[PDB]
Design a protein around this ligand. Sequence first.
Ligand SMILES: Nc1nc2c(ncn2[C@@H]2O[C@H](COP(=O)(O)OP(=O)(O)OP(=O)(O)O)[C@@H](O)[C@H]2O)c(=O)[nH]1
Ligand SMILES: Nc1nc2c(ncn2[C@@H]2O[C@H](COP(=O)(O)OP(=O)(O)OP(=O)(O)O)[C@@H](O)[C@H]2O)c(=O)[nH]1
Ligand SMILES: Nc1nc2c(ncn2[C@@H]2O[C@H](COP(=O)(O)OP(=O)(O)O)[C@@H](O)[C@H]2O)c(=O)[nH]1
Ligand SMILES: [Mg+2]
Ligand SMILES: [Mg+2]
Lengths: 54, 50, 431, 437, 437, 55, 104
Amino acid sequence: QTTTGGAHDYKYHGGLMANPQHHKAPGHWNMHYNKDLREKLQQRGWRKPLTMGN
Amino acid sequence: IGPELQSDLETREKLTRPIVRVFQRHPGTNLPEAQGIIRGAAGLDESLLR
Amino acid sequence: MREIVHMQAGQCGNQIGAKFWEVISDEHGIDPTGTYHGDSDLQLERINVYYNEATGGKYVPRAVLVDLEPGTMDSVRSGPFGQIFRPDNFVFGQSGAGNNWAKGHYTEGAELVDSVLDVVRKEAESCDCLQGFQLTHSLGGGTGSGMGTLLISKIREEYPDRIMNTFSVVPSPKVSDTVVEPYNATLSVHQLVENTDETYCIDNEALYDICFRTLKLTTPTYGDLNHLVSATMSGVTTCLRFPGQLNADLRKLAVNMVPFPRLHFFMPGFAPLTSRGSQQYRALTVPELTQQMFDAKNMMAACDPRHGRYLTVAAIFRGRMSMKEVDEQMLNVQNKNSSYFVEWIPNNVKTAVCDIPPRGLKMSATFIGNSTAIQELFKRISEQFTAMFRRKAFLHWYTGEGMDEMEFTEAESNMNDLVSEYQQYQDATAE
Amino acid sequence: MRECISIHVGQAGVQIGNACWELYCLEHGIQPDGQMPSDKTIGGGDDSFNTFFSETGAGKHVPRAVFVDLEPTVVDEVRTGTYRQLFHPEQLITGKEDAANNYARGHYTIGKEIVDLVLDRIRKLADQCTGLQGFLIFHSFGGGTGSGFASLLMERLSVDYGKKSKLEFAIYPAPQISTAVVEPYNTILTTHTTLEHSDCAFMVDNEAIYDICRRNLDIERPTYTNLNRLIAQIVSSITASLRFDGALNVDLTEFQTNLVPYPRIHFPLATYAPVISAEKAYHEQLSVAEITNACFEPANQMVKCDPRHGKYMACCMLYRGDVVPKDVNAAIATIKTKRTIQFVDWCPTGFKVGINYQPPTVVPGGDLAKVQRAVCMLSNTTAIAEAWARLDHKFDLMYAKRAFVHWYVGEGMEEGEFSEAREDLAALEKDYEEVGV
Amino acid sequence: MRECISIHVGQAGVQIGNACWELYCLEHGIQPDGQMPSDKTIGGGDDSFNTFFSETGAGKHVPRAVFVDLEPTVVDEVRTGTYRQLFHPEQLITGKEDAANNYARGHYTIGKEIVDLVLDRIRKLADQCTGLQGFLIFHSFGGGTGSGFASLLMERLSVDYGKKSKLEFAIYPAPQISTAVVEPYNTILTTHTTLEHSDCAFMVDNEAIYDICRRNLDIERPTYTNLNRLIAQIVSSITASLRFDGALNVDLTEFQTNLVPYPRIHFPLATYAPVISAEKAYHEQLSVAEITNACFEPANQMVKCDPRHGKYMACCMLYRGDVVPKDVNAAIATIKTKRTIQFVDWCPTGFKVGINYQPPTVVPGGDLAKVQRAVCMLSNTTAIAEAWARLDHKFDLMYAKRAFVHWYVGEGMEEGEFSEAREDLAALEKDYEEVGV
Amino acid sequence: MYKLDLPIDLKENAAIERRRNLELERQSRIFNAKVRTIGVDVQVLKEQVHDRDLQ
Amino acid sequence: SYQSIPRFSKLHPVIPRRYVPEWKNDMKNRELLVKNCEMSGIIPKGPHDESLFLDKRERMNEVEPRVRVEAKHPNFERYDGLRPEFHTAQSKYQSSLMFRKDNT
Ligand SMILES: Nc1nc2c(ncn2[C@@H]2O[C@H](COP(=O)(O)OP(=O)(O)OP(=O)(O)O)[C@@H](O)[C@H]2O)c(=O)[nH]1
Ligand SMILES: Nc1nc2c(ncn2[C@@H]2O[C@H](COP(=O)(O)OP(=O)(O)OP(=O)(O)O)[C@@H](O)[C@H]2O)c(=O)[nH]1
Ligand SMILES: Nc1nc2c(ncn2[C@@H]2O[C@H](COP(=O)(O)OP(=O)(O)O)[C@@H](O)[C@H]2O)c(=O)[nH]1
Ligand SMILES: [Mg+2]
Ligand SMILES: [Mg+2]
């Protein structure tokens, strides 16, 4: 039996002996909030397509 | 020297006690008490090293 | 991957080194055939430091067996663990040594030295990164002394950067076992001083006292003595072969023990040694292991450390143990025996910890002591030298096969200079 | 974006690396295979592993570490032990023969065969970052690889890499406990590199960690493993501002600008609170005041010198857990109303506070109790001169007789090294004294 | 905002502390593992235990006490007793070598490696507090830990805490009953150095409590447990105004200012009434006036000294239970009118009355009955000059031939300390006599 | 690679409101000062005690 | 313009952090406060260096000369302090003062 081999065994992350990982933040250049834009653009359904006929 | 917390000065022995605040409400002042305890601490330190 | 080339000269060397090879063989799991039959992969990982891949799972020692006369080498071959050796590593003449230094060194050792250099060159150039050489012999005979010193000199000339360990069992205080051993020991140590990196002086009287007092052992025989010497060899090279918390190889030990190039004669020792019927009365702790290490009766050198000062100490522990306990024990023994250590070097202790103890043991320990008490041994050899050099007894031989008296004078002057230095760094103070 | 490169050199450094990366894997949830089970991240801040683990392929996270030891035993044990697939094989660099406690062997003869490869691997590790915060360089003052090769390594890094942080975690010889004889020689020799090439050197003492584990952890027989784990706790609490959000985040640049007043006073002391066991965690309060007074505790520093005889210069508090400035300011006021703490004259404002959200992560099978509040104190006190004084005395009474000098001389090293390192140590002593007065 | 740190030093300190905190746990409903259970009106809003027990997140109510003794087996009896896991592990400080009934050994040689650690524990117990009101220190003047280490400890507490109220509970040696032979030395040499480091010093006597238990309690074969139970009751009666509200109440400072006339006359005797058993008290009309008289017989005090030979100076009465203050005032009027009690002419209003609603708490195994009314008298009178005279006579007799002095010289003392302690007690005798006239 | 569209926006919003859930967790922990200052968890402490005793 | 270069006394753990005297910043009746510092001529009235105590030290700078600071002695000698009277609080120190003998 080696000292470091017996000490550093397979350690299982998570479980009862763990805290939830508090991530810092996503990037503001990555964060676009387009879901709200989709649900806004769903409204006003009487639009006409921007084509030459209209 | 006193205790290791000047939140625990036992207001009687304080250099900002109400008596000396009444003192320093007027100009002049600058009592020779803090310098006296400076000299006493210095003398006791030299005695300790000797 | 470092390698050690082991050379054994003389009948004493060919017995002790064969026992050493057998001990490390059944420590690494090598069977008498030569194949690996261990259980762990640690025995197989660092195996090239002493062995060579011969046939699949077969490992052969890197031994070089040297003798002027095929004496104990034949018995080593015909004994157990004797066919693991490569058959052409046995280099042998047919004349005798006669316990004569010049026969071993100048006249009859001249015809075998080229063959031994060829064999050890073939062994050494096969290693990718050779570390050093380990010679086992006696400073009392002709083959162990003469051919041994010649081999050390030639190996130093060809490889002047490798670590040279010599064990070289030395003459006893009481009982001689050879009547010309003052001449032999003086002429051998005259070249062991200026050639070897380090030497582990062993006294048979100290071995007998170890067997009698710390091991009972009403019938010791030379097997137990060579076993103890083999245990010390395994203890001083275990950090190459097994991983540990704090490693220390041969070069590290040489750096950490010798303060000056002249002083490299050590006192080996092994712990724990228990009298048969006392293991139930003793309890295994690091403090008792260290106290048995630093006990004066435990070393294999007959000179007493109480008649001297410890220049340096190397403590190589083997076993699952605490570095805090090891360092605290070294600090405790150094502080309590404050008069047995030189004042101008603080912490005269180099520690090492190996994680693999010998089989059947929980903890083992190897003590290497560079002390100023070696001057007792050298003064004894110098006194028994100058007792007969003034009357020229047993010297017509050495004159007959052809050295001059100036060589004997230079050897005794070199011994006296070494005694003077060991006496100087015992009474020299810091400030 | 907030990457940091760890360089573990020496056997001691490789053991710090083992403990540090097992703790980092437990913190960020990378298995020893190298996979994250739950990874719902976009990039740019939410990838808290990115300061330590890079990215490759189908979800493999290789560490940003370089392991160096001339002796191929401990790194080979790492290569054949548990964290086998985690590390890239070329990061684990070995030699053939060690320097064997010899600064001359580590710096002048054996050293210039592997240093070029180490610099190439460091360059390859640094070229893949998107902005580098610094180097965490873990090594020893005991000697050999940790002194000579490490000295050459900081010399080369300070020549070429220039304006990057070079935080050097060095373990220091104890006042009385030692494992070598040429250790004072090596320790005095590796002073110029930490003065002229390091940006912040954390000297930590093995006997002090032994006393801490004996007194607070109830470990009667501590080994190197607990010491390695607690040093990993310290460096994780240092770096956690780069990985998890907090009320006040302190990066390495703010950290250095708040510690060091002069470029030669980059020797702070590191202490960690609490370092208790769980049976004491039952009967202890573990509030912010308690774990700050434990940081200012005399017998809780990690070198053997009490700061009662010294003067505090700049204390960087790194609070870690459920910690609020409502408690932090009360703790700071309680400290500043204490006589025993003696701040230096020219620093009225001497506290740099950084509060993090993520509580410390406990290793499953260690010694420290899992707590929701901790302080990593990094204080630049001037009481560190005691360590220089003890090694000064040891080097004086060793070098007075010129013992163990022929090794260094014959291994390609002029004997003026000892005198110049001696003068540099005396310069540091005098500088710290005139700063303290 | 109100707290009292308890320091039990010596074996006599530790056993009194065991009985005291058995009483405290029973008064506050603290189970022997240290947890308030749940509910029933006051739940999560109780502060009767704030002076004595802190709070933790495990529910453990950590004691605000330090049990220190230079000898083992008594702290070990605490650590293997019923209150094994009530106490904090580091709050139970023990040494290795016994102090050997020696003031010099406890003060100068063996007690110097324990005083720093016990001051560290007192610092932790004090910085766990925001409204600290005093240090209640329990020991005996028999010798060793209770004499030398206690004196050194109170000197260090005076240095480190200012002149905070350091209340003293001292087991004074009996006239006829004795345990040691070096008791006069150990008592004179500690009276000299603790005459000016304790603000108030309640003397108590084992022979007097033996007589009390034999006569008024029918416990014909008593042990130390009964004595410690009465001492626990008479300390809890003092402290109960800090934990239970009611009528006229008195803290640790008000009764000091109303008790000590001069700063060197700070040695009062103590009395508790009604010391009584169940079958004895069942035939009784236990009332305020007659329990005041019960405090006032000369054969009812806890010090073997007749108060009829002296004159009362200041009496602080502490009534507990359903006590109407008109009965207290009537009792004061009757004891003032009757001429068997003599008062000094410079104290017309010689009484300070504090009334608390909480009745005393009995223990399952004790000897005191559950009563409605109780009173604790702290009397500063000049009748302690007889005790000082007996101690002085024994000290002079055993010091005339220098018997038992080579031990003190070997473990670090002079004849100068003995001589200055002798003339210090002579000055104290003179001061008591001139105050009495 | 992939196109950046409505599933990517949904993943982004899930990340936002996960961050919200984590910070309300922290708010519930810190605005409850009996948990914030005198906290630490009995179950994990007991498991660690049993681990030490077993070791 | 002029040069100040503020200086301070040596350290003591009784000085309570920052403390300015009241009269320097006593603005209910200031209009005749400053002329008391003008007629004397020894007390500077400037806006700067108001902290009589800054960190833990006394200000040796332009707040009064050093004379008239130490001149408020009520004529207390070592003869009085080494034999204190009984009814004062200074008799709490008697056993540490009786070891001091009496010479000066
Ligand atoms: N705290 C701690 N210290 C260690 C550990 N391993 C080794 N050391 C220290 O390392 C010092 C010995 O020198 P090393 O660092 O091993 O030398 P090296 O860097 O391996 O270089 P070489 O001497 O050539 O082998 C001792 O003083 C130990 O304190 C460890 O796991 N933890
Ligand atoms: N009332 C009471 N008195 C006690 C008790 N235990 C010891 N004593 C007193 O203590 C005296 C004996 O000296 P100790 O106080 O035990 O001495 P120590 O504090 O143990 O210090 P060392 O003798 O050095 O170990 C006796 O005269 C007793 O009156 C107790 O439990 N109750
Ligand atoms: N410990 C030990 N010593 C031995 C052994 N054999 C011989 N010796 C020692 O070696 C010395 C004789 O030297 P020798 O080996 O005969 O020299 P050689 O004739 O040149 O080989 C004697 O003093 C013996 O004590 C052995 O098996 N074990
Ligand atoms: Mg190494
Ligand atoms: Mg006792």
